[PDB]
Write a protein that binds this ligand. Sequence first.
Ligand SMILES: NC(=O)c1ccc[n+]([C@@H]2O[C@H](COP(=O)([O-])OP(=O)(O)OC[C@H]3O[C@@H](n4cnc5c(N)ncnc54)[C@H](O)[C@@H]3O)[C@@H](O)[C@H]2O)c1
Ligand SMILES: NC(=O)c1ccc[n+]([C@@H]2O[C@H](COP(=O)([O-])OP(=O)(O)OC[C@H]3O[C@@H](n4cnc5c(N)ncnc54)[C@H](O)[C@@H]3O)[C@@H](O)[C@H]2O)c1
Lengths: 293, 290
Amino acid sequence: MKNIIKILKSLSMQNVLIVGVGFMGGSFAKSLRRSGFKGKIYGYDINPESISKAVDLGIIDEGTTSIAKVEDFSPDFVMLSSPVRTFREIAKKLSYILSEDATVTDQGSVKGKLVYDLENILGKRFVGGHPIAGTEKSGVEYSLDNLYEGKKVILTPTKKTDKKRLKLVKRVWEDVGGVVEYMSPELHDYVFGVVSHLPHAVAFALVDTLIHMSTPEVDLFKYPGGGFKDFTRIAKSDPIMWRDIFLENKENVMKAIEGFEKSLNHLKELIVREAEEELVEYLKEVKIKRMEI
Amino acid sequence: MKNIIKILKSLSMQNVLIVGVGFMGGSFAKSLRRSGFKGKIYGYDINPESISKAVDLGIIDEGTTSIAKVEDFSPDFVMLSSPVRTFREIAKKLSYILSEDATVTDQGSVKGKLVYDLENILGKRFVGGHPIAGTEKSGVEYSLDNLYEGKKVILTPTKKTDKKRLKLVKRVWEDVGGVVEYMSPELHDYVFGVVSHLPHAVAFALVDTLIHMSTPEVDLFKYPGGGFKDFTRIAKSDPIMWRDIFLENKENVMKAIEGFEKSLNHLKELIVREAEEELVEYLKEVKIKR
Ligand SMILES: NC(=O)c1ccc[n+]([C@@H]2O[C@H](COP(=O)([O-])OP(=O)(O)OC[C@H]3O[C@@H](n4cnc5c(N)ncnc54)[C@H](O)[C@@H]3O)[C@@H](O)[C@H]2O)c1
Ligand SMILES: NC(=O)c1ccc[n+]([C@@H]2O[C@H](COP(=O)([O-])OP(=O)(O)OC[C@H]3O[C@@H](n4cnc5c(N)ncnc54)[C@H](O)[C@@H]3O)[C@@H](O)[C@H]2O)c1
């Protein structure tokens, strides 16, 4: 009698649309299936090969490249997984196709104003999210059915978020193994501006530095074993994605670089003043914090 | 020809002194012993714990915390492996205590004027070296008997360098796995200023940024490897080692940081001014084959 928590659960989400059928879109589709989801998974992509590869791999049941065909799929759950620069335009087009009862959510690596813009486009259907997962992979062929297990997923509810959709999006992420927490859109963009965007910005600029400080007689790239090695991981990054993340989170990325410049300026001062003991303590305190994890 | 070359090497290294018995001094001691070396290995260190640990692990035959006692060791081959600013005053002491025929070399991460200062203190005894190998760990407990295997070692001979000792030091490094090349002391300090000292300075400051940008309600350290973790492994390195390197190589470290800043400033402006094409071109630089 009371056990019918089960039926509500099955009826809460029946036709799922993956927008952007790439690595993240496909890892989500796969992880969703692996958690025992029995409904339909549909794909929408501008690249018909993304759809082609995902269907034959069994990752979606069917898909399309015409936005207007999406309507035939009557999705009630949408996971935005294209580049974040596409989200506004696509959400414009979903806003008419989707029933008032649909839920839209996303995996976008930036939140901030984008969440407010998406909720204004989509009314009440929208819940912002960011799974702190990722690797340096692209394309559905690389999608993993456990990408999210044991990782943080940040949802960014507002005063406008629908509590039952927030709660569903939370539960769907936990079914795939994620650990959910909440941050405002603005706090999210500050936090990840600092812990994620800044570190990439600074790896980018390091590479640029070794290029202009090399001379015709000296290729500095020949000497990676002195500390530069870990920074060369930046070679695996996608320049277009970073370009878009930098632009979209510009105000937080600039604040983060600013606080970085303050830290580096402090280190220069200790160096030039030969502050022997201060310099040790500066390095010791960063040592301890970095070791905690 | 091999027999003899080997005899000569043996005889010229009966008594090795490791000065600073920590991660690099221990790695050197273990590497030498793994390579089949048969003489004595002694340790001298300011920390008595460094000595007893190294003895207990069978890394050195014997050691001491008194520089005077080094004379009883009659070292003929000394590998300086303490923090780089300890070298001058240690050398001064050694010059009285070591025989004229001994070789003194080093593992320090800075060369530059220190090579010259050390040649003036030690005379013909001295050969400047720097193995480009290490991790963030420090202390003899972390040392490894294959640390230098297949790694570059830079020697910095000058006008004044004794050729026999240069050949000796080179073959010792190649014996433990290293691949030797030469640079001038000054070229060394500019190369490694940019490629090793600046990336460390950058990693340290990155972690420091998360400290001050944190609030009591938001601990930025709860969110690591949004990529931070990968780029700051080297910010767990030793504060004394790194304080010494930054001060000893101060002018190059400043020149490297100034270079970096101009790159960072270029990047900022591309971001601020939303230059889609130029920004993506700048970022594409990580794809270069070098
Ligand atoms: N890669 C990561 O480490 C990572 C981590 C966390 C979050 N994210 C987020 O995941 C999203 C996509 O990332 P990905 O790594 O899967 O990229 P991806 O390259 O693997 O795939 C994106 C897919 O979107 C499709 N696409 C591109 N433009 C489109 C448009 N106009 N309409 C519909 N589809 C379009 C592509 O054709 C491709 O099939 C981004 O929003 C990114 O911020 C990525
Ligand atoms: N750690 C690395 O990656 C690495 C790589 C290449 C070169 N180096 C250079 O190696 C040398 C040793 O570094 P490490 O990583 O072995 O450091 P470490 O902390 O592991 O060891 C340093 C040792 O020297 C001792 N010491 C400190 N002051 C001394 C003094 N006044 N006299 C005698 N001993 C003293 C300490 O007690 C300790 O046992 C430094 O010059 C460093 O720049 C380090």
